[PDB]
Amino acid sequence: PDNVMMHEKKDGTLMNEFTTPILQEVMENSKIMQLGKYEPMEGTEKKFTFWADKPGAYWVGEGQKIETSKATWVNATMRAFKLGVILPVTKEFLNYTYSQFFEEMKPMIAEAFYKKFDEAGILNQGNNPFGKSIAQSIEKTNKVIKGDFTQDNIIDLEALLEDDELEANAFISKTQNRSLLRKIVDPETKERIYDRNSDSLDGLPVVNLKSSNLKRGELITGDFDKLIYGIPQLIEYKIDETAQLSTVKNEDGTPVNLFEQDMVALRATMHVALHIADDKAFAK
Amino acid sequence: PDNVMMHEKKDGTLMNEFTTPILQEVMENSKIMQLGKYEPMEGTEKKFTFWADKPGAYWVGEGQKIETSKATWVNATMRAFKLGVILPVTKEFLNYTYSQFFEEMKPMIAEAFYKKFDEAGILNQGNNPFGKSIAQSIEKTNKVIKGDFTQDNIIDLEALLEDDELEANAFISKTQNRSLLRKIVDPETKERIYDRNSDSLDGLPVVNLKSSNLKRGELITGDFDKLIYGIPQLIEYKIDETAQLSTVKNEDGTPVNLFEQDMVALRATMHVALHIADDKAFAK
C-alpha cells in the first residue's frame, strides 16, 4: 500500500524494503553477528544442530555424527526517542514523507539494538537474557585463567577448549587490550603474536566489543545460532516513558515536555554449545 | 523432466543443473581443487606414465628406460540431518520443489564432503583413504625438515623438490602458523619474504587448511590428479540408523522422534607423483 506519499502514519508494520537495510546495519555493527550461522524462521522454531560426520561408504561408520534438538524465541524492544525529537510536528512529517524517516532513522535505531544485544549476549550485564549466554556457559563449564598475558598462556587457553574436541575459531576482545597484546614477545624467538595491521590475535580474527564491563579479557567463540527475522514495527506517540530518564531525575512526561517519541521492537534469539573460554585479571 | 513444479520423488539421481552448483561449493572451499589438478574418469580409470627412448634411424641407443602403469578407485558418502531441520513436507516441499531444496543445503552436505576429502588426502588421519596421500608419500620418501622458520630453512624445504628435478608451486599451512611467518626477517636483501597483504610466501600462494592435525609446519604441493565422476545420488527415508545419536544417550530411531535424513554420495579419487616435502619443529 505505502511507498512515499506524505507519511502521516503513526502506527505501522514497516515494509521489508526498509527493514533489511536497517538489520544490515545491526549485523555489521554487532560483534556476535559477525561470527555465527543463522537459520531462518518466523515466531519460534524447533531445529537441529551439529555437523554430520562421514559414513565412509566401505568401513561401517567409525565416529558418531551426533544430533541434538533445540528451541528458539524472545523479542527485544528499543525506543529511539531523540530520533523522534528531530522531527517536531506532524506538518514537518508531511514534508519528510514515510521514506525519509527510515533512511535518516536507520543509523540510530540500529546502533541502539546491536549495543543492547552484545551487552546482554556476550556478557549477562544487560537484562534481556535467554539463559543460553556466553557468561552463563562459562559459569557451568569452568574455563577461567589468572591475570597473566603471555604466549604460553594464550596457547594453554586455546588448549582448554581443544581438550574437549572443538577447535579454536575466533576471538572477541576490546580496543584497550591491543596495548597489552603488543608487549607479549618471547626473547628466544623474537616475534609478536598479535598483528597490528590485520586485526588477528593468534592468527585467528579478533572483534572489538566496545562495552564498559570487562577490562583484561579474551573471549573465544565458535558455533552460534541466532535469529533476526520478524518485522521491527514503527509506533510513535506523544506520551510518558518510565524507561527514558531525562536530564537529571524524572519520568519525562510528553505533555509536560513537548517532544515526540518512536518505538521499534525487533525479534532476537541466541543459543550456545556450552564450551567457551574466558581470561580475567587477578592482581591479589 | 524435473525442474521446479513439485517435490515428491524420494530416491533418484541429481540433474547436472543442480550438480555443478553444489559441487562448485566443494571445490572453492576445499584445499585441493584450489591447489591441484583435474581430469574426467569413468568408474575407475587407468593411467600410464614415463618417457620412451626412440632413436633417429642412426643407432638404437644404450639408455633403455621403463614404463609404469597405475590406477585410481573408491568413493565417499554423506548422510546429513539438515533436511530434518527444514522438514515441513506438506507446505514447504511443495513450494520449494526440486530447485529450492538444494539451495537451502547448498552450503551444507557439500560442507561435510569437502572437509573430509582434505582430512584423508593431505593428511591420513581419516578412515576412508585409498593409499595415495601426501602424508604417506612423505613416509615413503623422507623429506622431513626439523627447525624454526628461518629464510634458509624455507629455501631448504623448497630445495628438496628441486633436488629431484621438480618445481615448487604453492603452500599448505594453517592460520595459527601465520604469526611465525611474519617474523621471517632476512639478514640480507628485502628483510621480509612473506607478503602480509597477499597470502604468499615466496610469490607462491599459501592455502590456509584449518585442520586440527597441523601444529606448526608447511607442506608444498603442485602435482595432483583429482578425479570426480558421476552425478550424485539422493535418497529420502525416515528410518533407524545403526550408528549416530538421537539426542544425548540413545540411538536415533525415527518412530520415536520424527526426523528426516538426506544422503549425498559423490564419487571422488586422487593420485600423487610421490615427491612432496614437509617441515616441522626440532624435538628437544
Partner: peptide, 15 residues
Amino acid sequence: QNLAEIARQKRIIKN
C-alpha cells in the same frame, strides 16, 4: 532468506 544470505556473505570467519 535475504537476511540469512547477507549473514553468510558478511561473516568474518569465511574459512
